Design a protein around this nucleic acid. Sequence first.
RNA 1: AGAACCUUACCUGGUCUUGACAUCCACGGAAGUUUUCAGAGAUGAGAAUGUGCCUUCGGGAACCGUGAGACAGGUGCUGCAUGGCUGUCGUCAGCUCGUGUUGUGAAAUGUUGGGUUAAGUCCCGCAACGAGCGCAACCCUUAUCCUUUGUUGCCAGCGGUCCGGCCGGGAACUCAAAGGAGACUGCCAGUGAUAAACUGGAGGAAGGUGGGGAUGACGUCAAGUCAUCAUGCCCUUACGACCAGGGCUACACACGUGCUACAAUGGCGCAUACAAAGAGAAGCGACCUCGCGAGAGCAAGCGGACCUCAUAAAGUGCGUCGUAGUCCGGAUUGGAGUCUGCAACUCGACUCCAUGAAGUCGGAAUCGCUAGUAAUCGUGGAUCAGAAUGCCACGGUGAAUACGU
Lengths: 110, 83, 99, 100, 127, 151, 208
Amino acid sequence: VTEVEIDGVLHEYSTKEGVQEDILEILLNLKGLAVRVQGKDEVILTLNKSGIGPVTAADITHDGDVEIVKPQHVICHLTDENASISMRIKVQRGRGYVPASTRIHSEEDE
Amino acid sequence: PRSLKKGPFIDLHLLKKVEKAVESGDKKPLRTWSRRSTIFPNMIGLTIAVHNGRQHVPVFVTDEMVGHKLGEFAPTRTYRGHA
Amino acid sequence: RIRIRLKAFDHRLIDQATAEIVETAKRTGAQVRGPIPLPTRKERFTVLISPHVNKDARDQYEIRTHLRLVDIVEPTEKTVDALMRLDLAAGVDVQISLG
Amino acid sequence: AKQSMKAREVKRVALADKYFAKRAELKAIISDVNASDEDRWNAVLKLQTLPRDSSPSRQRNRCRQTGRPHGFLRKFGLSRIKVREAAMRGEIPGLKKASW
Amino acid sequence: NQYYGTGRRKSSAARVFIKPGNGKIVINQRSLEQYFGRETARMVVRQPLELVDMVEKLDLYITVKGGGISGQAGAIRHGITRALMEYDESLRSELRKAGFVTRDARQVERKKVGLRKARRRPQFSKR
Amino acid sequence: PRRRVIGQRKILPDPKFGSELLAKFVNILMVDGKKSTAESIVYSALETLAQRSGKSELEAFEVALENVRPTVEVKSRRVGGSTYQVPVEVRPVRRNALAMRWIVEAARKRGDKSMALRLANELSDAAENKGTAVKKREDVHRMAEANKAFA
Amino acid sequence: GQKVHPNGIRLGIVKPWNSTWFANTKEFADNLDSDFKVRQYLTKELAKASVSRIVIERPAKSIRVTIHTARPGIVIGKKGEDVEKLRKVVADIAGVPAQINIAEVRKPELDAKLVADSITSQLERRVMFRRAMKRAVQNAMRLGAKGIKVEVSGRLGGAEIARTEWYREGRVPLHTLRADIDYNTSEAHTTYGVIGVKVWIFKGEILG
RNA sequence: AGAACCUUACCUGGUCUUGACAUCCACGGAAGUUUUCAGAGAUGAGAAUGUGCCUUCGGGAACCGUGAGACAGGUGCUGCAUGGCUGUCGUCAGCUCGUGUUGUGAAAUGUUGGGUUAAGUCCCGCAACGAGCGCAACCCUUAUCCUUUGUUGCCAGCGGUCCGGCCGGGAACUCAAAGGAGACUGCCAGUGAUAAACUGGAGGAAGGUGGGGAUGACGUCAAGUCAUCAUGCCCUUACGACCAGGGCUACACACGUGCUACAAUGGCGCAUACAAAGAGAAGCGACCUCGCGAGAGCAAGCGGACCUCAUAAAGUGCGUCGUAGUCCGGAUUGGAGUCUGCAACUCGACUCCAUGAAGUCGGAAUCGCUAGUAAUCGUGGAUCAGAAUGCCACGGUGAAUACGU
């Protein structure tokens, strides 16, 4: 996971309506994710879910060439039934460790 | 000309007026703009002042005028001569 | 068999789409027919370019609509469904048709 | 074009939208050779009664931006002049200058 | 065994096959005399063969599409030449000399805005 | 033109006799790009002519042509106040063409019914040394003779 | 009206399209109209925000707008407050689900349209047109444009007789198709009349 | 890139005046839905249904109604106030600048000169040295090849046959796109100033910019357009708005651009062959049936390499006419009708039967075209209910001539 895009958010240190984990907790639990793409080298997934209960990794509306190999990876704990969450993840492919500070100016595509 | 299956054309209002006239038995001229209206057998005898664009020109209907339209007997343009 | 009609204005984009579709097909199912190029529609337009008058003054535009016919011979359980989540790049109208 | 003209056009369109079902039916009736003469006559008269702006052959295709009656194109809904501008700007997808 | 050459001229596209035989020409399941009513066309299709004495030696099956008659004939001729080239590869020089190896690239010039035709300008007047 | 002389384009010989000259003649005759009809007409003319004069079809035609070819034509220089027509020796390629053209013109003129027939008649006349083309040729020559002072 | 439009001639090669969607003859005109509307709205809204290029892209009955702007901060406002607001209106305009993206324009002195806009603004607030033009040219050059041209036309300094003046610097090849020529235009609605500003900015040649 | 109505901006009448088109409040009513008489119509008067999103209830946002004004509206004037867009010389090879130098200076030089080129193209020289915009190249298309992928496209070799690629199939060929290769005076000889080049030839599908297109320098014409659009005085119970009818189609005449002719290289009749490129859902409309025909009825196939428009015509073969104002020519007019359309009187197209003008190659003069060009033959498209001989496209056949300046 490289870029996470949640709707109705300002920064990662805010909080959201209807969830348990805070947004830094959500970003950590998304950093632990294990994805296996086949054809492309950069894909965009989608997670949309409402209702009371935990948000597994098995709730992501998969495409054809992406395979999420951990169907019990928890991300959120939605508590309000009127709460919703719609994040759009971006999954690149590389090696080593490239962090946010160096990837703050390295990124060319404005 | 109009198709035979469609019948002849006459404006509804004009027709009504004609009918009224017939009923009355009057011979006062009916001023009309429906130049596109065909003349009918029942219209024979009536004077009907057809518009020519500018003014209503009186047309005493005859037995020979039936198949024709009202605009045929009310010429619009007014050319006398070039000299 | 699933016939797939890709239509787009940009040819490169269309090509990219086609490849992607093939990839999607080939991992899940087996015996993908192939990316068959149909004839391109070159819908031309002439227009007068002056605001008022100059009739010989003209621009002749066109829109090249490209067609790609991809067919899938064996529809399995896994394969057909894979396209639902697998949306293609924008500006490429796809048209799947089984049988 | 004027605003007024545009408004008129819009009105015409609206009328067309409204009266389509009836008008079409009337037309069908008039056509139908296997039908009564009186009925046909009535239909013909009925049609006359309906508003003129209800006809689709009344409404003129104008440019969707400027309302210019002439030089129109159907695919774009725009007059030639505006179409060209759009093309130049990149606003019409796929459209580029053609040579052969 | 059958040898082959593609023919092309104007909007025509001939598919000439050369086989060893007696010298019978079939064009779209019809004889040379049946298909080409014109003598000139016939001549053009026989030209290359005439040039290199193999008229009696080889049969040729043809199918041609597109264009008119003369163009079609030309295409056929071209195809034949190609076939010959493929088959012998030592008759090339003669063909070149003749001017049959050359694909005649003359297409119809497009109509151009302003003009009534490819080059005919409309009638001019100062007044 | 000003800039560059160009090589004359390739002409195919006619299918019947295998002649370049004949082909050229046919082309000249032709109108509206209806070559085939024109060629047929030419053939007809030849056949009739052959029948008339004996010989061959081609040979006879050649002979006919020979009687209408101009040795010398004239051109307008006009260097002075008034125009001076100057004679010039007309080249092999051109002379042949000119004769053919003249013949065609004569045929066109002629009062006989079918085109082919007319052409044949013209050819015959040429062979014999009477007719329209021959007259034209004579006139051309005559003019040249008159203006022989200029050279 | 001599010259061909520099963007328009290059759409197949080095320049891309703004509206990027497919549609059949049925829905195409409507789509175009929608695009025109939304774009118009955006221009109206984000006038004070320096906006260069609106790129519309609609897949699967849902409109994706991409606003190229020099300062995202004023277009975004507070994080997801202004953008969100924009989105619903865009959707309304279209009649479909909307999605607004905002690209940050690096080097607004090299973006031609932006420059033009700036010039227009300057003209409106009664500066010496010439000085503005100079500034435009100079700045671009400083920033690393291979070349720039700008042209302004009509009622310059409120003069009765209209004229055009233009400043070029570096190289601005227009006949060369492979040249990245960012062209754009603007109009200063001054007290004396309109003053049209054209500007060509040559980023460099593309090799492919 | 299409005037019957509409379009329409004009005329005649009939009407409206915060208005047909917007924003704003005030307050009357949910919007809207159906129907009635008068009227040329615009409009002016009636009968049925509904009360949705929310209220410490002075009410609201959509959508009608009325009055006030703020304003709307103007295809009204100025293109000699403008922007934008366009023509034009001219796709002509030119037009400039910086720094240096020359001249009191306007200016010059570069940019001239020797050659050469399609080219201010290139070389060589030289008080110039450099640079930019243009001349070229990059882009599309067309001409040859290769690779990839083969249905709705193809059928070389295989088997079957209703002798139809139609059905097993085959992936060859055509064709279809996508990606590469190829042409650069690169190779050879001569001429040339030890050059740039030129002349020829070899190969090659293509040869010297291969053919065609797009591309239009600085500028010129106070060139065109305020009626596309935008934009810096005038009208605002009317130079604004609605309506019906008429006009834009008038006709002593003059000019422009086209079509069709005057015939036999032809007309007519019967048979019969070979295209390309396009369009199509309020759309293209097979087959079959009826109609002399335009068409009508029924009604599949098809958002389309599949189905439809859709028979290409000139051509070819056989017959006839035999140089006549004709079996040339079709105008004109009468009758009767078909379709579109509320509606074909003014004023549509097409059909049938009749009618059968002028015209026998055109005065002075005057235009186009150098090749797949002209000439000629059909085909399609846009606008478009309908309405092209125009415009924009497509292929068929297919010349003549260029000595030269």
